[PDB]
Design an enzyme around this catalytic site. Structure first.
Site, PDB file in Angstrom:
ATOM      1  N   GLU A   1      10.389  95.196   7.043  1.00  0.00           N
ATOM      2  CA  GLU A   1       9.265  96.153   6.893  1.00  0.00           C
ATOM      3  C   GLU A   1       9.818  97.392   6.193  1.00  0.00           C
ATOM      4  O   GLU A   1      11.065  97.624   6.238  1.00  0.00           O
ATOM      5  CB  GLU A   1       8.655  96.481   8.259  1.00  0.00           C
ATOM      6  CG  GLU A   1       8.168  95.262   8.988  1.00  0.00           C
ATOM      7  CD  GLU A   1       7.035  94.551   8.278  1.00  0.00           C
ATOM      8  OE1 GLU A   1       6.347  95.207   7.448  1.00  0.00           O
ATOM      9  OE2 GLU A   1       6.840  93.351   8.549  1.00  0.00           O
ATOM     10  N   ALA A   2       8.953  98.136   5.525  1.00  0.00           N
ATOM     11  CA  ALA A   2       9.360  99.225   4.616  1.00  0.00           C
ATOM     12  C   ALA A   2       8.441 100.421   4.799  1.00  0.00           C
ATOM     13  O   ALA A   2       7.460 100.320   5.580  1.00  0.00           O
ATOM     14  CB  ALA A   2       9.383  98.736   3.194  1.00  0.00           C
TER      15      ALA A   2
ATOM     16  N   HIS B   1       2.685  92.911  14.018  1.00  0.00           N
ATOM     17  CA  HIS B   1       3.064  94.340  13.833  1.00  0.00           C
ATOM     18  C   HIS B   1       4.588  94.544  13.785  1.00  0.00           C
ATOM     19  O   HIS B   1       5.001  95.682  13.470  1.00  0.00           O
ATOM     20  CB  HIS B   1       2.402  95.217  14.913  1.00  0.00           C
ATOM     21  CG  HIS B   1       3.093  95.208  16.239  1.00  0.00           C
ATOM     22  ND1 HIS B   1       3.124  94.086  17.052  1.00  0.00           N
ATOM     23  CD2 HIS B   1       3.739  96.184  16.918  1.00  0.00           C
ATOM     24  CE1 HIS B   1       3.778  94.369  18.167  1.00  0.00           C
ATOM     25  NE2 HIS B   1       4.168  95.648  18.110  1.00  0.00           N
TER      26      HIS B   1
HETATM   27  C1  LIG Z   1       2.165  93.629   6.270  1.00  0.00           C
HETATM   28  N1  LIG Z   1       3.435  93.667   5.527  1.00  0.00           N
HETATM   29  C2  LIG Z   1       3.575  94.444   4.397  1.00  0.00           C
HETATM   30  C3  LIG Z   1       2.420  95.219   3.889  1.00  0.00           C
HETATM   31  C4  LIG Z   1       1.269  94.577   3.424  1.00  0.00           C
HETATM   32  C5  LIG Z   1       0.185  95.318   2.969  1.00  0.00           C
HETATM   33  C6  LIG Z   1       0.244  96.701   2.937  1.00  0.00           C
HETATM   34  C7  LIG Z   1       1.387  97.340   3.388  1.00  0.00           C
HETATM   35 BR1  LIG Z   1       1.491  99.233   3.320  1.00  0.00          BR
HETATM   36  C8  LIG Z   1       2.471  96.617   3.864  1.00  0.00           C
HETATM   37  O1  LIG Z   1       3.622  97.284   4.255  1.00  0.00           O
HETATM   38  C9  LIG Z   1       3.812  97.475   5.652  1.00  0.00           C
HETATM   39  C10 LIG Z   1       5.216  98.028   5.836  1.00  0.00           C
HETATM   40  O2  LIG Z   1       6.227  97.037   5.540  1.00  0.00           O
HETATM   41  N2  LIG Z   1       4.713  94.578   3.738  1.00  0.00           N
HETATM   42  C11 LIG Z   1       5.818  93.918   4.237  1.00  0.00           C
HETATM   43  C12 LIG Z   1       7.066  94.101   3.441  1.00  0.00           C
HETATM   44  O3  LIG Z   1       8.024  93.342   3.512  1.00  0.00           O
HETATM   45  N3  LIG Z   1       6.984  95.099   2.518  1.00  0.00           N
HETATM   46  C13 LIG Z   1       7.958  95.488   1.587  1.00  0.00           C
HETATM   47  C14 LIG Z   1       9.254  94.987   1.474  1.00  0.00           C
HETATM   48  N4  LIG Z   1       9.870  95.469   0.443  1.00  0.00           N
HETATM   49  O4  LIG Z   1       8.945  96.344  -0.158  1.00  0.00           O
HETATM   50  C15 LIG Z   1       7.816  96.324   0.550  1.00  0.00           C
HETATM   51  C16 LIG Z   1       5.763  93.107   5.326  1.00  0.00           C
HETATM   52  O5  LIG Z   1       6.733  92.375   5.763  1.00  0.00           O
HETATM   53  C17 LIG Z   1       4.521  92.932   6.042  1.00  0.00           C
HETATM   54  O6  LIG Z   1       4.398  92.152   6.999  1.00  0.00           O
HETATM   55 MG   LIG Z   2       8.562  91.926   4.840  1.00  0.00          MG
HETATM   56 MG   LIG Z   3       6.295  91.573   7.675  1.00  0.00          MG
END
Ligand SMILES: Cn1c(-c2cccc(Br)c2OCCO)nc(C(=O)Nc2cnoc2)c(O)c1=O
Ligand SMILES: [Mg+2]
Ligand SMILES: [Mg+2]
Ligand SMILES: Cn1c(-c2cccc(Br)c2OCCO)nc(C(=O)Nc2cnoc2)c(O)c1=O
Ligand SMILES: [Mg+2]
Ligand SMILES: [Mg+2]
Lengths: 223, 222
Positions: free
Chosen positions: B12-13, B183
């Site tokens: 997550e980021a 989450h």
């Molecule tokens: C739900 N969600 C999303 C996400 C989806 C839609 C909108 C948003 Br804002 C999101 O980010 C939520 C924080 O990770 N992003 C990631 C993720 O890996 N994001 C990264 C990784 N490297 O750059 C961006 C998730 O694993 C996840 O489950």
């Molecule tokens: Mg991710």
């Molecule tokens: Mg994720």
């Protein structure tokens, strides 16, 4: 002499369990371990029947090739055997495993306190034996440790007048009126211990701050 | 040839890629091939194997999370600092490599939308430390690419608007309920494990055939 700085309040509680090939008399070997690192604030500064785990935790769960057969009782209790661990390409307790435990602990603010149920009889001296067999006897000299059985008895006595079971399952049922999930697996036992410790966390932290012992005082089980 | 270890992976980021985000959380779940190939001899959702290795860590990102990131993940930079979390550093990079070294090779990282999110961000974090080569021994697969390929090979050719390949959308199509946990990085990795246990033999053939060296993943940003 220049005196040791008092460590002060424990900043990280690392809930800790290992499973083994058998009982201490057998000179057992590790088959599984789980560390779950919780910051003090997650207990000092957190209603459902069983409180959820804190959102912010660090967790490490690993299976270990023991290099000898499990006792039948140990295998039935843990659902692990040496043959299945070998079918999953598991590696023995080695320098890389010791490096990984220390790297994990180094992500946590100090002082570190390891908290294990029956830690003094089981998990603490076995970990010291495994590290001594690698010639890594000093690996965790930086850490503090508490046996949660000792802690919870002293809390129960302090919150009692003048025998109950102190099995992990027993304490959990008295507090929460259900059995813990995934019992006699290292991660299952650590999550159940965390749940028990979130019951009266302020009282537990007071006790841990006062009674935490340098890990270096734990002698190896054998070696 | 055959991957010996599948490492289900999620980070997550702080925000979406245009924000040049920082890692807030990561989870690795290492499963031996045999745990998928030959599960123990049904419930609505298959159980996780008994024998797993797991690592789940929170990371201090060094900047604010977007409101959408905080809402979706339940993490914020203030809360991570309250829990004394450390930045993505050499010790973390060493910890990840020591965890992979517990597993037999070949290693295959499996991440949902891995090619757009988790893989390039992991490469960005390693590159900002001067550790560009750290995990280039590993292979990787984007489970979206894998599941799309399996679905195309097990359906008539697609026409009109396509279905969502969100983690939640795939899980619901297969199991008829939402994942237990939507989450956390650990929740996302356990849900992906459940999805990949649906047709594990067809998934392993595809992985064996299409796994990419991790070193071919370019960092999300410099
Ligand atoms: C739900 N969600 C999303 C996400 C989806 C839609 C909108 C948003 Br804002 C999101 O980010 C939520 C924080 O990770 N992003 C990631 C993720 O890996 N994001 C990264 C990784 N490297 O750059 C961006 C998730 O694993 C996840 O489950
Ligand atoms: Mg991710
Ligand atoms: Mg994720
Ligand atoms: C249930 N159980 C038992 C156990 C209890 C009763 C009978 C047997 Br056999 C047990 O061993 C099952 C294998 O660990 N032992 C441990 C344990 O840490 N044993 C150690 C550690 N160092 O040397 C021996 C557990 O964590 C646990 O949950
Ligand atoms: Mg134990
Ligand atoms: Mg146990």
């Amino acid at each position: 002499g220049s005196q040791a700085l008092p460590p002060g309040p424990m900043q990280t509680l690392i809930f800790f369990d290992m499973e083994a090939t058998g009982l201490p008399f057998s000179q057992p070997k590790v088959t599984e371990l789980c560390l779950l690192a919780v910051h003090r604030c997650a207990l000092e500064s957190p209603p459902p029947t069983v409180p959820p785990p804190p959102r912010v935790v660090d967790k490490l769960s690993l299976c270990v090739a023991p290099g000898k057969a499990c006792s039948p009782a140990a295998s039935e209790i843990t659902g692990l055997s040496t043959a299945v661990l070998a079918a999953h390409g598991r590696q023995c307790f080695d320098d890389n495993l010791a490096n990984l435990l220390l790297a994990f602990l180094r992500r946590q603010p100090q002082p570190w306190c390891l908290v294990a149920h029956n830690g003094d009889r089981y998990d603490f001296p076995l970990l010291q034996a495994e590290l001594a067999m690698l010639g890594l006897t000093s690996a965790l000299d930086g850490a503090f440790c508490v046996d949660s059985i000792t802690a919870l008895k002293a809390l129960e006595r302090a919150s009692s007048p003048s025998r109950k079971s102190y099995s992990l399952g027993s304490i959990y049922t008295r507090l929460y009126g259900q059995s813990p999930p995934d019992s006699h697996t290292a991660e299952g036992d650590v999550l159940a211990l965390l749940s028990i410790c979130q019951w009266r966390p302020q009282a537990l932290l007071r006790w841990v701050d006062a009674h935490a012992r340098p890990f270096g005082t734990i002698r190896p089980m054998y070696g």
